C-alpha cells in the first residue's frame, strides 16, 4: 500500500512539473492534485474508478468530520486507529512505532483486502467482505469467480462513471470560461472587437461563427463531415455562411466561398441528425463545407470577422513517399 | 638524492622554528590547504611527511641533542608538519578558523542520519521528478520546488547512493563538512596534547 | 530499479571482462582467461555496457 500510494505521488507530481513548466498562465488553478480530487484513479478495461472526494463521503459517515468540505487529509495524515479516533501529522507514534499515510489505510479496507481475498478463493470470506462493502450481487453473477467476478464486483462499488462524471463537472472550465482566457490566442484580431466579446460571453444572439480544423469520414464515402465547434452564435441548416480559408484576409478576396450550410448534425459516435439550430460552445459534425475547404475552415457571417489562428498542430510533415500507379490508365 | 635533500630541509626545523605544531590533514579535501600555504606564507611554513618518523629517529641521535625523542611516537594517521616560531595558540586559532568545509559524500558510508527538512528549495521545476525517484515527497507549491515533510534519506552506517548525493549537493546539504584538526604542539621538545 | 540495486546487479553482470577468443564472461581485473579452450589467453576486452 505504501509502495502504491508513492506510485500515484511519483506520477501526479511529475505531471504537476509538466503543468508548471508551461507556460503563459499563471492562472493559479492550472496544477492538479489528489487532495483536490482532480485527478481520478481507476481502470478502463475493468471499468472501475474513484476520486478522493468519493472516499471522503464514505469515511466521514464512518467516524469523521467535516463531510461537505475540508476533508483533504486523505493523502496526508496519518491515522493510527486502535488507540483513539485522533490522527497526527507525525510519521511515528510517541512509542517509536511506524504508521501509514491514511490513503494506505482507506485503500486497504476495500481494495487490497478484496483482491487478496479474491486470489485466496475463500468462498465464505468473500460473502463476508461483500457485506462490509455493502452490496450487490444479483442472479447468476453470484455464481461467478476469478478475474471476471472481481471486475463485475468492482464496477458496482466504484463505477468509473461516478468518478469521471464528478471529475468532469467539478474541476473543469465551461465554454464560457474556456473561451474567456483563450480567445486572445485563438482570435488573431484585436481583443476589443465585438466578436471577441461574444466569444467571451459565449453568445447565441451575436455574430456567427466557428472553425472545423479536422474532418471525420462518412459511412458512404466519397464525402466526409466537418467536425467543428461553434465559437459564437447559433447555426442553423440551409443558411448562408462565409467560408474563409486558411489564409483569407478580411480586406482581401482570396480563399472566400460564400455558401449555404447544407445540414447540421450533433455528433454522437455513429450518428445523428436531429436539429437545425445549434448554439456556440458546442461541438458539431457539419456537412456542406467539404468541397470548399481544406483542413482549416474559419466560417463567418460578417465581412469584418477575422480568420482564426492557423495552428501550430506542429509535429512536422515529415517523411516523403513517392506514389506511382500500375497500368497508368488508373492515374 | 631527493631523500637527502628532504633530510636536509627537515634539519632546519626544529632548529628555527622551535615550535613545530603537527596536524593531519588525512582527509581535507583541498585545494584550501594551498590557501593555508598562502595565508601562512607571510609568517609560517608547512612541510608534509612520509616515513619521516625514521628521519626524526636518525636526527634523534646527534649526541648533543636528545629532545627529538619526544617527536618519535606521535605521528598516527596521514599527518604533516606546520612549523612556526610565532607562538602556538595563535596558530591553533588560525588553522581551526580556516577549515575546508566543501561537498560532500557520494558512494561512501554516512556517519549520521541525513535528515532533510521541509520548506522551499529555491528552484524552478525540473528535478522534482529526480527527487521522488529516491524517496523524497515533493510538491510544487506555486512555481518553486518544495519538500513535503521531514524524512530520513539515508541512516548512519549505510552507504550513500550516487543519485542521493547529487540532490544533497544541490539543495539539501548533508552536511559532510570537515577539516584538519591539530594533533600535537612542541617547542623544545615538549609534549603537548593540543586542547 | 533504485540505482543501488542496478549497481548491484551490473556488478554481477556488466562490470565484467570477456575473453576475445572464447567469448567467455570473465572477471574484470583478470589478466588471463580461466577457460583452457582458448589457451588461457590474455586477449580480453570489457563486456559492453547497455546504451
Ligand atoms: Zn578465453
- The DSSP result for A181-241, as a single string, is HHHHHHB-S-TTSHHHHHHHHT-SSS-------B--B-SSSS-B-EEEEE-SS-B-SSEEE
- Say how far apart CA A200 and CA A144 lie, in whole Å: 54
Q: Which of B106, B101, B110 is nearest to B31 (CA)?
A: B101
Grid coordinates given for A302: 460578417
Instruction: Assess contact for A251 and A304: CB atoms under 8 A.
Output: no
3-state secondary structure of A114: helix
Strands A298-300 and A239-244: antiparallel
The packing angle between helices B89-98 and B32-41, to 10°, is 150
Q: Which of B147, B125, B129 is nearest to B138 (CA)?
A: B147
- Say how far apart CA A269 and CA B27 lie, in whole Å: 72
Instruction: Assess contact for A255 and A307: CB atoms under 8 A.
Output: no
- Say how far apart CA A108 and CA A101 lie, in whole Å: 11
Q: How far is CA B193 from the centre of its chain?
A: 18
| Resolution of this entry, Å | 3.6
Q: Which residues keep their CB under 5 angstroms from ion ligand 1? A: C 19, 22, 24, 33, 35, 38
The phi, psi pair for B110, rounded to 5°, reads -85, 135
Q: How far is CA A3 from the centre of its chain?
A: 28
3-state secondary structure of A278: strand
Span between the terminal Cα atoms of chain C, in Å: 17
Per DSSP, B188 falls in state S
Q: Which of B93, B101, B100, B5 is nearest to B44 (CA)?
A: B93
Alpha carbon dihedral A57, A63, A69, A70, in 10-degree steps, equals -130
- Say how far apart CA A323 and CA A275 lie, in whole Å: 42
What residue has cell string 463545407? A289
- Say how far apart CA A67 and CA A110 lie, in whole Å: 20
Q: How far, in Å, from the CA of C47 to the mean position of ligand 1? A: 13
Cα–Cα distances in angstroms (integers) from residue A126 to residues A123, A132, B75, B130, B155, in the given order? 5, 10, 74, 41, 42
Q: Do B143 and A20 touch (CB under 8 A)?
A: yes
Grid coordinates given for A204: 447565441
Grid coordinates given for A188: 488573431
Q: Which residues of B touch C4 (CB under 8 A)?
A: 159, 161
- Taking phi over 0 as left and psi of -120 to 50 as alpha, with beta for the rest, A138 belongs to beta
3-state secondary structure of A67: coil
Positive or negative: CA dihedral B124, B129, B133, B139: positive
Positive or negative: CA dihedral B153, B157, B163, B169: positive
A177 CA: distance to closest CA in chain B (Å): 22
3-state secondary structure of A103: helix
| Gyration radius of chain A's alpha carbons | 27
CA count, 13 A, side-chain hemisphere, B193: 1
Per DSSP, B160 falls in state P
3-state secondary structure of A5: helix
Grid coordinates given for C51: 546504451
CA count, 13 A, side-chain hemisphere, A184: 6
3-state secondary structure of A55: helix
Instruction: Assess contact for A32 and A15: CB atoms under 8 A.
Output: yes
3-state secondary structure of B151: strand
B164: closest chain C residue by CA: C3
Instruction: Assess contact for A106 and A55: CB atoms under 8 A.
Output: yes
B60, burial (CB in 10 Å: exposed 0-12, middle 13-18, buried 19+): middle
Span between the terminal Cα atoms of chain B, in Å: 39
Q: Check CB contact of B163 with chain C, cutoff 8 Å.
A: yes
Name subunits touching A (3+ CB pairs < 8 A): B
- Residues making up the binding site of C: 19, 22, 33, 38
The phi, psi pair for A184, rounded to 5°, reads -60, -40
Q: Which of A189, A187, A269 is nearest to A231 (CA)?
A: A187
Please work out, in degrees rounded to the nearest 5, the angle formed at the alpha carbon of residue A275 by the alpha carbons of A271 and A278: 100
Helix (H) or strand (E) holding A282: strand A282-286
- Say how far apart CA B116 and CA B160 lie, in whole Å: 14
- Say how far apart CA A250 and CA A306 lie, in whole Å: 6
B71, burial (CB in 10 Å: exposed 0-12, middle 13-18, buried 19+): buried
- Which regions of A13-118 does DSSP assign to beta strands (E)? 41-43, 48-50
Grid coordinates given for A158: 466504484
Q: Give me the residues paired with residue B182 across strands.
A: B23
Alpha carbon dihedral B143, B146, B148, B151, in 10-degree steps, equals 160
Q: Give me the residues paired with residue A239 across strands.
A: A261
Q: Which of B146, B139, B140, B149 is nearest to B171 (CA)?
A: B146
Instruction: Assess contact for A31 and A20: CB atoms under 8 A.
Output: yes
Per DSSP, C44 falls in state E
What residue has cell string 635533500? B5
Peptide bond between residue C47 and the one before it cis (omega within 30 degrees of 0): no
Grid coordinates given for B25: 590533514
Amino acid at each position: 500500500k505504501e509502495d502504491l500510494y508513492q506510485t500515484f505521488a511519483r506520477t501526479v507530481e511529475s505531471v504537476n512539473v509538466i503543468v508548471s513548466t508551461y507556460a503563459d498562465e499563471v492562472l493559479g488553478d492550472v496544477q492538479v492534485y489528489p487532495a483536490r480530487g482532480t485527478v481520478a484513479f481507476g481502470s478502463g478495461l475493468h471499468g472501475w474508478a474513484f476520486t478522493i472526494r468519493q472516499f471522503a463521503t464514505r469515511y466521514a459517515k464512518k467516524f469523521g468530520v467535516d463531510k461537505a468540505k475540508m476533508m483533504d487529509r486523505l493523502w496526508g495524515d496519518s491515522f493510527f486507529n486502535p488507540k483513539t479516533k485522533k490522527w497526527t501529522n507525525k510519521d511515528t507514534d510517541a512509542e517509536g512505532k511506524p504508521l501509514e499515510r491514511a490513503f494506505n489505510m482507506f485503500i486497504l479496507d476495500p481494495i487490497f483486502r478484496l483482491f487478496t481475498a479474491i486470489m485466496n478463493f475463500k468462498k465464505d470470506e468473500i460473502p463476508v467482505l461483500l457485506e462490509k462493502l455493502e452490496i450487490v450481487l444479483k442472479g447468476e453473477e453470484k455464481d461467478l469467480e476469478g478475474k471476471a467476478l472481481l471486475k463485475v464486483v468492482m464496477r458496482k462499488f466504484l463505477p468509473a462513471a461516478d468518478a469521471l462524471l464528478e471529475m468532469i463537472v467539478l474541476h473543469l472550465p465551461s465554454p464560457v470560461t474556456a473561451q474567456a482566457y483563450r480567445a486572445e490566442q485563438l482570435y488573431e484580431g484585436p481583443a476589443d472587437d465585438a466578436n471577441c466579446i461574444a466569444i467571451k460571453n459565449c453568445d447565441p444572439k451575436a455574430d456567427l461563427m466557428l472553425y472545423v480544423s479536422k474532418m471525420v469520414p462518412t459511412s458512404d464515402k466519397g464525402r466526409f463531415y466537418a467536425f467543428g465547434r461553434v465559437f459564437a452564435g447559433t447555426v442553423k441548416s440551409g443558411q448562408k455562411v462565409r467560408i474563409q480559408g486558411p489564409n483569407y484576409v478580411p480586406g482581401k478576396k482570396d480563399d472566400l466561398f460564400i455558401k449555404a450550410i447544407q445540414r447540421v448534425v450533433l455528433m454522437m459516435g455513429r450518428f445523428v441528425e436531429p436539429i437545425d439550430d445549434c448554439p456556440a460552445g458546442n461541438i458539431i459534425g457539419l456537412v456542406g463545407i467539404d468541397q470548399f475547404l481544406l483542413k482549416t475552415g474559419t466560417l463567418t457571417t460578417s465581412e469584418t470577422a477575422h480568420n482564426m489562428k492557423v495552428m501550430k498542430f506542429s509535429v512536422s510533415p515529415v517523411v516523403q513517399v513517392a506514389v506511382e500507379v500500375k497500368n497508368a490508365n488508373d492515374l | 638524492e631527493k631523500k637527502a635533500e628532504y633530510f636536509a630541509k627537515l634539519r632546519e626545523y626544529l632548529e628555527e622554528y622551535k615550535s613545530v605544531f603537527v596536524v593531519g590533514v588525512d582527509n581535507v579535501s583541498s585545494q584550501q590547504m594551498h590557501e593555508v600555504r598562502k595565508n601562512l606564507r607571510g609568517r609560517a611554513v608547512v612541510l608534509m611527511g612520509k616515513n619521516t618518523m625514521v628521519r626524526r629517529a636518525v636526527r634523534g641521535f646527534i649526541s648533543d641533542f636528545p629532545d627529538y625523542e619526544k617527536l618519535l611516537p606521535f605521528v598516527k594517521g596521514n599527518v604533516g608538519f606546520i612549523f612556526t616560531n610565532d607562538s602556538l595558540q595563535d596558530i591553533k586559532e588560525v588553522i581551526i578558523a580556516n577549515k575546508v568545509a566543501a561537498p560532500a559524500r557520494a558512494g561512501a558510508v554516512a556517519p549520521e542520519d541525513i535528515w532533510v527538512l521541509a520548506v522551499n528549495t529555491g528552484m524552478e521545476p525540473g528535478k522534482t521528478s529526480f527527487f521522488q525517484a529516491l524517496g523524497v515527497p515533493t510538491k510544487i507549491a506555486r512555481g518553486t520546488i518544495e519538500i513535503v515533510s521531514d524524512v530520513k534519506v539515508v541512516d548512519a552506517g549505510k552507504r550513500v547512493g550516487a543519485s542521493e548525493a547529487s540532490l544533497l549537493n544541490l539543495l539539501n546539504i548533508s552536511p559532510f563538512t570537515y577539516g584538519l584538526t591539530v594533533v600535537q604542539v612542541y617547542d623544545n621538545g615538549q609534549v603537548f596534547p593540543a586542547s | 530499479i533504485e540505482p543501488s540495486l542496478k549497481a548491484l546487479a551490473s556488478k554481477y553482470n556488466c562490470e565484467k571482462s570477456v575473453c576475445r577468443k572464447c567469448y567467455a564472461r570473465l572477471p574484470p581485473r583478470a589478466t588471463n582467461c580461466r577457460k583452457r579452450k582458448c589457451g588461457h589467453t590474455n586477449q580480453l576486452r570489457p563486456k559492453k555496457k547497455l546504451k
